[PDB]
Amino acid sequence: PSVFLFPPKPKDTLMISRTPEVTCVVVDVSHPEVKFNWYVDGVEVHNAKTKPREEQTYRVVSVLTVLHQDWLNGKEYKCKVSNKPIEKTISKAKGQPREPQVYTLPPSRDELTKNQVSLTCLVKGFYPSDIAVEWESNGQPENNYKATPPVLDSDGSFFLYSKLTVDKSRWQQGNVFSCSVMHEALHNHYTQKSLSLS
Amino acid sequence: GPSVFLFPPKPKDTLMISRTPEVTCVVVDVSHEDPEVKFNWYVDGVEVHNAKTKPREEQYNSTYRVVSVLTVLHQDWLNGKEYKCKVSNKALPAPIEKTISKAKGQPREPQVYTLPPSRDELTKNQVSLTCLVKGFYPSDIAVEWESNGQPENNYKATPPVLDSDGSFFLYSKLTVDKSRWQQGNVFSCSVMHEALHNHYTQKSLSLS
Ligand SMILES: *[C@@H]1O[C@H](CO)[C@@H](O)[C@H](O)[C@H]1NC(C)=O
């Protein structure tokens, strides 16, 4: 009945050493088997790997490795599911890519009454939405941060915010935190900004 | 065969007295052959009759999407009333029932923090004022911006995101001419949520 076709992880398409994949997820299957057909700009490929079956009905996932440049150039990946057929497609959005602007914002004066404070990373003006944002300090990832999903801005670019939560004492001490952003329009697909008490 | 989805009211509708919150019952994959759907609606088990039936809209794969809309009293949504949709159709062997209500769980008041633009952005012709709303439950909220009495043209909120303590947060970005910011003009983030006193709080932001 139901088919979902996810794109590759942003970080996996921008680092050459990682391996980006398109995942075609079928759910709500009978007790049973399913046929996958895969196409790249209309042309069938047979290198996709089907994962083991996953219960509750049954969930079946097929994973196709994509070439980094095929995705960034924006080839279409089409998944066809046949069973006792539904087609789904995905692709990097068309349009002039745009460099993200990364701004780190310290916590509000008001938040300093709380045991934990929020450090905020604003990433805006970027296209397409595919992006990866991470927090770290002293060359180590932080335990507790989350980002919003990308949101479409009025100019047709995307933005998002990443909220890092830390113990106040750690911020008041003078520790430096850094928001790392990875995106295709960035030189080296990578930029970092820092933020510390001052 | 046909499937049934029941949607809650848009959050801004449940929080403003001038707006019309409604629960929406959506039946998809209704056939061309038997396109007739009977809706029954109940609130805490009592049948109600004021629901509105929308014209069916055909999916060009020769099926219909069929929708019924029940307007809800702001206070009943707020107090935890269950809304029930029962759907009947020739294709179905038994009618299908779905129940929806406001999210259960101890309500929590939003903390509201306005943040100025980063130094770096003052480079630009427009700058971003930011309103961080965190700590809140349930997720239904409304965040708006204004100054000097008027609402602001150019802003957008993220959706609410589930934080790690089981509360929600979200951010609202307001964009303004750098000039307006430099000049000391005062901007206010407003926030409407059930757990706030009078369901409303307001926080300001200027050159500080
Ligand atoms: C027809 O199209 C709609 C719209 O995408 C889809 O939700 C529905 O499942 C389809 N029904 C079919 C193919 O019978």
Distance between the termini of chain A: 56 Å
Classified in CATH, the superfamily of the largest domain in chain A is: Immunoglobulins
Biggest interface goes to:
A-B, 29 and 26 residues
Number of strands of chain A: 18
What is the CATH topology classification name of the largest domain in chain A? Immunoglobulin-like
Q: Level of helix content of chain A? A: under 10%
Q: Tell me, what is the CATH class of the largest domain in chain A?
A: Mainly Beta
> How many domain units of chain A?
2
Examine the secondary-structure arrangement and name the CATH architecture of the largest domain in chain A: Sandwich
Quaternary state reads homodimer
Strand content of chain A: over 45%
The general outline of chain A is elongated
Q: Give the topology string of chain A: H per helix, E per strand.
A: EHEEEEEEHEEEEEEEEEHEE
Structural class computed from helices and strand pairing of chain A: mainly beta
- What composes the largest sheet of chain A? 5 strands, antiparallel
Region (CH2) (chain A): 1-94
Region (CH3) (chain A): 95-198
Subunit structure (chain A): Immunoglobulins are composed of two identical heavy chains and two identical light chains; disulfide-linked. Interacts with FCGR1A; this interaction mediates IgG effector functions on monocytes. Interacts with FCGR2A and FCGR3A.
Domain Ig-like (chain A): 1-91, 100-196
